[PDB]
């Protein structure tokens, strides 16, 4: 099937009366479905007290240096695929969005030193504190195949990336982790890939014509 509607419309039509049953145990999440208030990149000190009310030892000045070590150690675990180490530095909204496309291919991401010091932009808040931090760093990329042939980016030349990495913290044992990465609409286009792509048009039945 494709959707949840098309399953229930086929489970009704097949006679599959499946009972919606009640259970005492619920799915205990530790993330959110994206960002609370979507920051749009070109006053929120209420949300820094609501973070300090549960944590009670947290400085907004220290955190961009903490934000780099969350960002850098998350991206070095892509070079080895240490999935037990990504799960403590990256929330489960961000872990399928940085590992599912890179399975069965090797990446050789490497961090060289930044250009601008990181600084927090906004802060928002069974309660999830959320911190957006701006990153103007200098990175390299080299993504390969199964067969080891280069498919994206050269290995030596460092590039300039502008990043707004939203962070999140569940508020008893969770820490600050990467949650998502804001890509603005005015961002310059990414580096062109090394191979050429074909895009098929409509697959036409003999009765259908091309208009």
């Amino acid at each position: 099937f494709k959707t949840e509607k098309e399953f229930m419309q086929h489970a009704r039509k097949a006679g599959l009366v499946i009972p919606p049953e009640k259970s005492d145990r619920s799915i205990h999440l530790a993330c959110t479905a994206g960002i609370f208030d979507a920051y749009v990149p070109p006053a929120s000190q209420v949300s820094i007290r609501r973070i300090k009310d549960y944590d009670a030892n947290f400085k907004i000045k220290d955190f961009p240096e903490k934000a780099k070590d969350i960002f850098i150690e998350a991206h070095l675990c892509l070079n080895n695929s240490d999935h037990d180490r990504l799960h403590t530095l990256v929330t489960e909204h961000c872990f399928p969005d940085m590992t599912w496309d890179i399975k069965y291919k090797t990446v050789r991401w490497s961090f060289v030193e930044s250009l601008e010091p990181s600084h927090v932009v906004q802060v928002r808040c069974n309660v999830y504190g959320q911190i957006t931090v701006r990153m103007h760093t200098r990175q390299t990329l080299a993504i390969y195949d199964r067969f080891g042939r280069l498919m994206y980016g050269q290995e030596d030349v460092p590039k300039d990336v502008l990043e707004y990495v939203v962070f999140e913290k569940q508020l008893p044992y969770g820490s600050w982790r990467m949650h998502t990465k804001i890509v603005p609409p005015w961002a310059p286009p990414k580096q062109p890939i090394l191979k050429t792509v074909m895009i098929p048009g409509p697959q036409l039945k003999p009765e259908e014509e091309y208009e």
Partner: protein, 166 residues
């Protein structure tokens, strides 16, 4: 049961050195439990076993057999996989390196014969395995010429020794 052909698409080679020729892509694909026999599939699998993938889809569109309609569904899904998942840029730059057919788990029914006797009818199933290698197909081996037969005969005369002596 074993499913080792599905796992061959997950081998990750180390990233290549620039002082090394480019490794061609390999795309292992299979369909299991085809309601067709494993030795009627061999004539279709032997036919396409060296061809490029566009010549293979041509010679299977016009075969009258049942399995040619099924191999053409396998070769099209493995060609769509090679540009999607295994990083081949050209659809046309593939050829069939291996094309075999194993037997599958077959069912058993009862065929009644002419008296109290009977027979055990077996409902045949089969597998079909393919590997596409990225590249132009290699040229077929020509017959060895009269020069090459004469070299092998003279090399067989040149190699003989005085046997059972010093």
């Amino acid at each position: 049961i074993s499913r080792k052909w599905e796992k061959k698409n997950k081998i990750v080679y180390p990233p290549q050195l620039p002082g090394e020729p480019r490794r061609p892509a390999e795309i292992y694909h299979c369909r299991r439990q085809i309601k067709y026999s494993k030795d009627k599939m061999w004539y279709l699998a032997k036919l396409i076993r060296g061809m490029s993938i566009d010549q293979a889809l041509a010679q299977l569109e016009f075969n009258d057999k049942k399995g040619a309609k099924i191999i053409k569904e396998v070769l099209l899904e493995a060609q769509d996989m090679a540009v999607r998942d295994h990083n081949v840029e050209f659809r046309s730059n593939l050829y069939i390196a291996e094309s075999t057919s194993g037997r599958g788990q077959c069912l058993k029914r009862i065929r009644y014969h002419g008296r109290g006797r009977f027979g055990i009818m077996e409902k045949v199933y089969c597998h079909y395995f393919v590997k596409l290698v990225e590249g132009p197909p290699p040229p077929p081996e020509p017959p060895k010429t009269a020069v090459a037969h004469a070299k092998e005969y003279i090399q067989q005369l040149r190699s003989r020794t005085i046997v059972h002596t010093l």
